[PDB]
Amino acid sequence: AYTNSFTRGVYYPDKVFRSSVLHSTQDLFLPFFSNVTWFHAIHDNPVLPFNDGVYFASTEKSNIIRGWIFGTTLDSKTQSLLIVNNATNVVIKVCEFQFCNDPFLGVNCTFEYVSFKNLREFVFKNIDGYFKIYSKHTPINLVRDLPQGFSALEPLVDLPIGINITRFQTLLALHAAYYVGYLQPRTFLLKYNENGTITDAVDCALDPLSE
Amino acid sequence: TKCTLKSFTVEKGIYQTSNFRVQPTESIVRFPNITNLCPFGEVFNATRFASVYAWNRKRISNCVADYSVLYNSASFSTFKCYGVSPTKLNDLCFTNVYADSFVIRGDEVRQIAPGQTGKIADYNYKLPDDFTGCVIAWNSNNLDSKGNYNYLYRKPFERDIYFPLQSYGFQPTNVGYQPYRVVVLSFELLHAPATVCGPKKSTNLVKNKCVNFNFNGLTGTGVLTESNKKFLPFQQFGRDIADTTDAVRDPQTLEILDITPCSFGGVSVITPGTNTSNQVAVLYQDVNCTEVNVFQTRAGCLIGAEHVNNSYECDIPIGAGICASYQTSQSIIAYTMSLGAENSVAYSNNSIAIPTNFTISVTTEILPVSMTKTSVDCTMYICG
Amino acid sequence: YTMSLGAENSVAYSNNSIAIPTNFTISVTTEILPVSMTKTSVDCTMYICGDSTECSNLLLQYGSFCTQLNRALTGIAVEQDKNTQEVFAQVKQIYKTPPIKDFGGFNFSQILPDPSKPSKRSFIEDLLFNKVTKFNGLTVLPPLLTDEMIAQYTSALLAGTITSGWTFGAGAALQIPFAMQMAYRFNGIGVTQNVLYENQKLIANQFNSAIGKIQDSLSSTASALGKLQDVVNQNAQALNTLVKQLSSNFGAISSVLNDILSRLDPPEAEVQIDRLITGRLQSLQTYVTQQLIRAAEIRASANLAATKMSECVLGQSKRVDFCGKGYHLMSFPQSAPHGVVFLHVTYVPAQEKNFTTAPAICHDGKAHFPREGVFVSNGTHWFVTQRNFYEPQIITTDNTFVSGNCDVVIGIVNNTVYDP
Amino acid sequence: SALGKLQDVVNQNAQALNTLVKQLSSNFGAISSVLNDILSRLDPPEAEVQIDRLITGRLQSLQTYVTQQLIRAAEIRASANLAATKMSECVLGQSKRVDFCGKGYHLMSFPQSAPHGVVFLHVTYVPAQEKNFTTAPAICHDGKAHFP
Amino acid sequence: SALGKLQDVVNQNAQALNTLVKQLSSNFGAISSVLNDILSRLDPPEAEV
Numbered sequence A: 001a002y003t004n005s006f007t008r009g010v011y012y013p014d015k016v017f018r019s020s021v022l023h024s025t026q027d028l029f030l031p032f033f034s035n036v037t038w039f040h041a042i043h044d045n046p047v048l049p050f051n052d053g054v055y056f057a058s059t060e061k062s063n064i065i066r067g068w069i070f071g072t073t074l075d076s077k078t079q080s081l082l083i084v085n086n087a088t089n090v091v092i093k094v095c096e097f098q099f100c101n102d103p104f105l106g107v108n109c110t111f112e113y114v115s116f117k118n119l120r121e122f123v124f125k126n127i128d129g130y131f132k133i134y135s136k137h138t139p140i141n142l143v144r145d146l147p148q149g150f151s152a153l154e155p156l157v158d159l160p161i162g163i164n165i166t167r168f169q170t171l172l173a174l175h176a177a178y179y180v181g182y183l184q185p186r187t188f189l190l191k192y193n194e195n196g197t198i199t200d201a202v203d204c205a206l207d208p209l210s211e
Numbered sequence B: 001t002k003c004t005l006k007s008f009t010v011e012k013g014i015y016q017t018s019n020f021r022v023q024p025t026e027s028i029v030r031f032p033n034i035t036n037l038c039p040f041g042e043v044f045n046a047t048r049f050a051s052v053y054a055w056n057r058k059r060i061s062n063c064v065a066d067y068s069v070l071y072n073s074a075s076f077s078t079f080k081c082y083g084v085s086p087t088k089l090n091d092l093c094f095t096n097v098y099a100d101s102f103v104i105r106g107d108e109v110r111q112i113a114p115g116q117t118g119k120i121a122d123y124n125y126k127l128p129d130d131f132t133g134c135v136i137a138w139n140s141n142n143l144d145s146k147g148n149y150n151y152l153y154r155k156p157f158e159r160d161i162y163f164p165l166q167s168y169g170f171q172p173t174n175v176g177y178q179p180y181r182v183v184v185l186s187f188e189l190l191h192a193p194a195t196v197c198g199p200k201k202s203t204n205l206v207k208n209k210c211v212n213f214n215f216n217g218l219t220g221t222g223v224l225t226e227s228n229k230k231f232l233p234f235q236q237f238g239r240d241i242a243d244t245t246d247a248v249r250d251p252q253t254l255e256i257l258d259i260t261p262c263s264f265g266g267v268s269v270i271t272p273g274t275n276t277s278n279q280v281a282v283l284y285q286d287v288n289c290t291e292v293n294v295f296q297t298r299a300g301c302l303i304g305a306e307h308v309n310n311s312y313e314c315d316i317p318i319g320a321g322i323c324a325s326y327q328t329s330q331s332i333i334a335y336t337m338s339l340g341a342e343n344s345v346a347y348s349n350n351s352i353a354i355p356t357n358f359t360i361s362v363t364t365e366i367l368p369v370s371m372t373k374t375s376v377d378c379t380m381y382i383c384g
Numbered sequence C: 001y002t003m004s005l006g007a008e009n010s011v012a013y014s015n016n017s018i019a020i021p022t023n024f025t026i027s028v029t030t031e032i033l034p035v036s037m038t039k040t041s042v043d044c045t046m047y048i049c050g051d052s053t054e055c056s057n058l059l060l061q062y063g064s065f066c067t068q069l070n071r072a073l074t075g076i077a078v079e080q081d082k083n084t085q086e087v088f089a090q091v092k093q094i095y096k097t098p099p100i101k102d103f104g105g106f107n108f109s110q111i112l113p114d115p116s117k118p119s120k121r122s123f124i125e126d127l128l129f130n131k132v133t134k135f136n137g138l139t140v141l142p143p144l145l146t147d148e149m150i151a152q153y154t155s156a157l158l159a160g161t162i163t164s165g166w167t168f169g170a171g172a173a174l175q176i177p178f179a180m181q182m183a184y185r186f187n188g189i190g191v192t193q194n195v196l197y198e199n200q201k202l203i204a205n206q207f208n209s210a211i212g213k214i215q216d217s218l219s220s221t222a223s224a225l226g227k228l229q230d231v232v233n234q235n236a237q238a239l240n241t242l243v244k245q246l247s248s249n250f251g252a253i254s255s256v257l258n259d260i261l262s263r264l265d266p267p268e269a270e271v272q273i274d275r276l277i278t279g280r281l282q283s284l285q286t287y288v289t290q291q292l293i294r295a296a297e298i299r300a301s302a303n304l305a306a307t308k309m310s311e312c313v314l315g316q317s318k319r320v321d322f323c324g325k326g327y328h329l330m331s332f333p334q335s336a337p338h339g340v341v342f343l344h345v346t347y348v349p350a351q352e353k354n355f356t357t358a359p360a361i362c363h364d365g366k367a368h369f370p371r372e373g374v375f376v377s378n379g380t381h382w383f384v385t386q387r388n389f390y391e392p393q394i395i396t397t398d399n400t401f402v403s404g405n406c407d408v409v410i411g412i413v414n415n416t417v418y419d420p
Numbered sequence D: 001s002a003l004g005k006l007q008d009v010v011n012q013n014a015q016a017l018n019t020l021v022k023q024l025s026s027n028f029g030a031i032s033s034v035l036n037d038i039l040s041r042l043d044p045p046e047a048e049v050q051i052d053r054l055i056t057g058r059l060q061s062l063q064t065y066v067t068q069q070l071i072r073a074a075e076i077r078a079s080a081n082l083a084a085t086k087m088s089e090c091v092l093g094q095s096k097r098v099d100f101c102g103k104g105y106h107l108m109s110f111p112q113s114a115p116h117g118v119v120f121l122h123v124t125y126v127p128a129q130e131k132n133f134t135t136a137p138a139i140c141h142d143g144k145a146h147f148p
Numbered sequence E: 001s002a003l004g005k006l007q008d009v010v011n012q013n014a015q016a017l018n019t020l021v022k023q024l025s026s027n028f029g030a031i032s033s034v035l036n037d038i039l040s041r042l043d044p045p046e047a048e049v
């Protein structure tokens, strides 16, 4: 099952404030109007390749999707970044955790940190061993597919894990469909408003008009 | 004016000679107030270093790095820095520091450098061609030598965990084959939250005054004011179109400061010919009469010229309708240029004016027709 | 599609047929000419090496590159004021219109200055001004003549024209009724002044309607102001490119001179600063060369505008299409941002009729030729009429002159020449 | 100061040549501005680098000079065309164009040679002394309008 | 030769294009005028120079 990414997947590329200016950047973005593999959480969590970066989005009504797993083997044989959001605590671990055959939650550690109606988007990528997470929480009223609109993603987490990542997996809390994209080194023209919020973007390789 | 014209006689007119520039009063140095000392001790005084095939990469962050003791220490056989100068490490400071500790044979030290190739620079440890940091090596023939066969050799910064793996024997009787403890300090200079900064004391910040600032190694001169720009929590620096820094966040107090360059502008000297007088009037272009017989014009601040209500024909143009001249006791005067005498025409619907006379007038018009036919021998000019 | 060159129009030509207009229309056209451009000045030392003693000392090794660029930009800036002065200051006195606007039915309140404004500019001038719109050593010098002074010069030219014809441009201003001035102009285009003195009301109404249509065009079309806005756009793009060139590396480790200085000792700080200096100096030289090339063009346009002012406003031009399509009557200058706008009032024939013509006429064996105008026939009777307006008159010995005999002229016809 | 642009051209050309000559004393980063001094002090491997710096600097200076000369030559060509037009339409004939041949009504012109230029003596007719009169567009004699 | 400046413009433009094309064969101090030859013989550290 596929769907259209529309204009989703736009995030702030650097940590420099700009206002009322059109800035062109060369960074791993999600292509506009691309196909994002669609999965269901009804009545479905393969291990997905990581490639060069991942765009992850989900629509939630009861907080079913709460965690992610990153690694290469995911069987305690190699360091695996693990994120869990239980109750009101955000937990991140890098331990070589031993994973089950079908890992899900019921309803040499070198780092550790402990802190439809909702659309949650996430971006995961590794550059030079740096694990960055960009996210944006916005309310929606739609269940069929990802809503159409533009909303930039800001970074919240920057981990120097240094892990070689090739595959990842999603954690489901079983007693919310999710979409997975991929990033490419595409050229974008970002429109910063007066307040410095990226309100519009142009995908330079989308069509001759955008060219 | 005389020096600018390369002449001892100055013709009548207005000349642009120098540039006015406000100077800073005091210097501001600002760093996060972290008293932790960076654990270079556990890296440089470690009991045993790892092998070159599996060199250890230690993260150094959230501490003060004193590079002066390392530089002055005489135990070091070589200390080569490629990205930054060793004497600037105390002022400059970095987001993160990587220290790669491993042991290299005597002849292979030269291979640990950007742009180098060989059996070491390409196989068991590769450095980027744009590497920014320092390579530190000292002899360890009195600590690591035995035979010591625990050290083995086999993309940049790659840890590669008839075999392609070989080992050498370390003996005290082997210089070019003796064990060298070589550690590579790698720095990242991306503009980001800084956690490793040198032992320089911060000072109090002064606002609304031309100061020479220093924010986490980002230096410059300007006036610091409170700004209403909403930096996001991950944002540290602001930038303008010309890539220069426009706003900063104080690392000690989470507030945003607007940086505006200190006042500057061209300086124009309005003078009659030195054949007539040595008195001059100075125009400070496009500045107010604050940072500099003071007359304020739209062309700048005019000093030395007396403003006069009477309007005359323009003699020495200034700008925005103001002209200057040398007029009576004599001095330089400033006035608005006169476009000519007003002449109302006695028009009516049945009146005509007809000339009863005439005059023959001969005028002169000069037109360039040609210029000098120069020719330059390019070969002889460049390489005579 | 293939573009069309225009509608095809076959001309009904024959050896004895002539078409003469019986009516006319007064048309006012608008021509916009750039006169000057922005007087920019770039501090080369501050642009290349802003507040850096080491960079300035290294730049001193390049000789007089900085000073010659400054010299070229100063020359351009002075030439701009020269262009404006040449175009507008062609009147030796500041004339002003009489307080009573009795111009025989011609309404000039549209282009005369409006006293109620804070700046005495006409309504069309305000329309023109409302349609056309850093810290790195790049400064903009103000023009010598303010917009108020330009408006005063244009008002003086307009008042002198309206009240004195071409006499103020020739010598001292000589007052003349505007109806008589228009009769002068009509005689200037080969149309008898009786035409004006008989159609004065119609001509005044046509002139007022044309001026109103100029209002409509200027208020409705943004693209009417063309090359004048194009110059502004080109200068803005040049400055933007020059500013953006400061962010380039040119091969250096960083585009920030302070960052290079704070990280490296002199031995290779000098190499990095040399790369930056080379890049920024090349950028400055490119900008200066482009500015000189464009300043030459603006100077040429300013010379054209001065020529048009002298030969079109201060006088009447016999040159075709130099002052708008048609037969030129008069022009009115208007100020525009860094330019001048001319309102060319021209005479255009409108309604034609076919007549049978003849090169000459035999009366007593002698060939009669028209003194002024041509012979026409309405089918039965022959008349002599002026070329640009149908006004037939009886063929008399006062209208024609005798030359030769009937046996030489080809196409001669028989008629009777009345003797008063 | 009567002769203006004509002397201005000479000044500009002389200043351009002076700047081009003075550019030979610059280093452009080389150890010495003297090519003979560089040659007599260094072996070819480094003399090549020093001479490369000097060549780059001097070649760029020549290009700047030539570009300035082309731009100025275009202006001089335009002025020469203006002078030819004035000669043809003002000396060889009588001009009806206003202010093309001096202020007033043009009568005749006389050409005079000038250093790298031409000087025109425009003889013009200028009305001097005026009087106010009462005018009328036409006159009735027998019901018919008479026009001059 | 009746057509003068008109043919002169064509000649000048052709000479300008010919000079621009011939400029591609110059070394400007590089080891070779062929960019592919430089790329196929050197690693990036001096291939960039």
Ligand SMILES: *[C@@H]1O[C@H](CO)[C@@H](O[C@@H]2O[C@H](CO)[C@@H](O)[C@H](O)[C@H]2NC(C)=O)[C@H](O)[C@H]1NC(C)=O
Pocket (backbone or CB within 6 Å): C022, C023, C024, C202, C205, C206
């Ligand atoms: C010449 O053309 C003008 C048009 O501009 C004619 O004037 C019009 O006359 C009609 C009556 O026949 C009026 O209704 C219009 O209002 C007039 N127009 C204007 C602008 O005043 C004029 O009659 C024509 N003359 C001849 C001899 O044909």
Ligand SMILES: *[C@@H]1O[C@H](CO)[C@@H](O[C@@H]2O[C@H](CO)[C@@H](O)[C@H](O)[C@H]2NC(C)=O)[C@H](O)[C@H]1NC(C)=O
Pocket (backbone or CB within 6 Å): C107, C108, C109, C110
């Ligand atoms: C010339 O035309 C202008 C229109 O631009 C006339 O001014 C208008 O006059 C009427 C009175 O009939 C007023 O109601 C308008 O407000 C005026 N408009 C403006 C813009 O002022 C002017 O009266 C005309 N001149 C003559 C002598 O009739």
Ligand SMILES: *[C@@H]1O[C@H](CO)[C@@H](O[C@@H]2O[C@H](CO)[C@@H](O)[C@H](O)[C@H]2NC(C)=O)[C@H](O)[C@H]1NC(C)=O
Pocket (backbone or CB within 6 Å): C378, C379, C380, C381
């Ligand atoms: C050609 O013009 C003549 C002169 O105007 C015309 O002759 C007159 O015609 C009018 C009719 O409108 C009569 O009232 C006059 O008495 C005629 N006068 C003379 C002297 O003939 C003639 O009709 C015109 N012919 C054509 C074909 O237009």
Ligand SMILES: *[C@@H]1O[C@H](CO)[C@@H](O[C@@H]2O[C@H](CO)[C@@H](O)[C@H](O)[C@H]2NC(C)=O)[C@H](O)[C@H]1NC(C)=O
Pocket (backbone or CB within 6 Å): C362, C412, C413, C414
């Ligand atoms: C104009 O009138 C003259 C007479 O005044 C005509 O001349 C006649 O020409 C014919 C043919 O050549 C001769 O047979 C006659 O003898 C001529 N008349 C006289 C009185 O000698 C002439 O043909 C007329 N032209 C036109 C075009 O009608």
Ligand SMILES: *[C@@H]1O[C@H](CO)[C@@H](O)[C@H](O)[C@H]1NC(C)=O
Pocket (backbone or CB within 6 Å): A002, A034, A035
């Ligand atoms: C996306 O998938 C649809 C099928 O649902 C297909 O028609 C379309 O070509 C695909 N687009 C891309 C870019 O893969």
Ligand SMILES: *[C@@H]1O[C@H](CO)[C@@H](O)[C@H](O)[C@H]1NC(C)=O
Pocket (backbone or CB within 6 Å): A193, A194, A195
């Ligand atoms: C910027 O933020 C302020 C909040 O004080 C808000 O009032 C304003 O509308 C915002 N402007 C834009 C362009 O979003």
Ligand SMILES: *[C@@H]1O[C@H](CO)[C@@H](O)[C@H](O)[C@H]1NC(C)=O
Pocket (backbone or CB within 6 Å): B040, B041, B044, B045, B069, B070
């Ligand atoms: C290592 O120890 C020596 C003394 O044995 C000391 O002088 C040196 O400073 C230490 N290294 C560092 C990085 O401090």
Ligand SMILES: *[C@@H]1O[C@H](CO)[C@@H](O)[C@H](O)[C@H]1NC(C)=O
Pocket (backbone or CB within 6 Å): B032, B033, B034, B251, B252, B253
């Ligand atoms: C600097 O000191 C102040 C107290 O004066 C403190 O609030 C602030 O957190 C310190 N900065 C850092 C980075 O800890």
Ligand SMILES: *[C@@H]1O[C@H](CO)[C@@H](O)[C@H](O)[C@H]1NC(C)=O
Pocket (backbone or CB within 6 Å): B287, B288, B289, B290
């Ligand atoms: C100069 O500063 C004063 C305030 O002291 C201000 O009123 C004035 O507008 C300023 N003028 C200019 C040209 O900056």
Ligand SMILES: *[C@@H]1O[C@H](CO)[C@@H](O)[C@H](O)[C@H]1NC(C)=O
Pocket (backbone or CB within 6 Å): B307, B308, B309
């Ligand atoms: C001009 O005159 C006014 C009033 O007469 C006076 O206030 C003003 O100071 C005068 N200007 C100068 C420069 O003297």
Ligand SMILES: *[C@@H]1O[C@H](CO)[C@@H](O)[C@H](O)[C@H]1NC(C)=O
Pocket (backbone or CB within 6 Å): C012, C019, C352, C353, C354
């Ligand atoms: C004159 O006759 C031709 C014949 O075809 C006709 O086309 C033309 O319209 C006529 N002239 C006028 C003014 O009607």
Ligand SMILES: *[C@@H]1O[C@H](CO)[C@@H](O)[C@H](O)[C@H]1NC(C)=O
Pocket (backbone or CB within 6 Å): C015, C016, C410, C411, C412
């Ligand atoms: C004009 O041309 C016609 C042919 O259409 C011819 O019959 C007549 O004789 C010619 N007239 C003259 C004067 O050439």
Ligand SMILES: *[C@@H]1O[C@H](CO)[C@@H](O)[C@H](O)[C@H]1NC(C)=O
Pocket (backbone or CB within 6 Å): B346, B353, D130, D131, D132
């Ligand atoms: C004509 O009358 C006006 C009325 O003021 C006067 O100013 C003018 O001087 C008179 N003309 C001459 C030539 O004197």
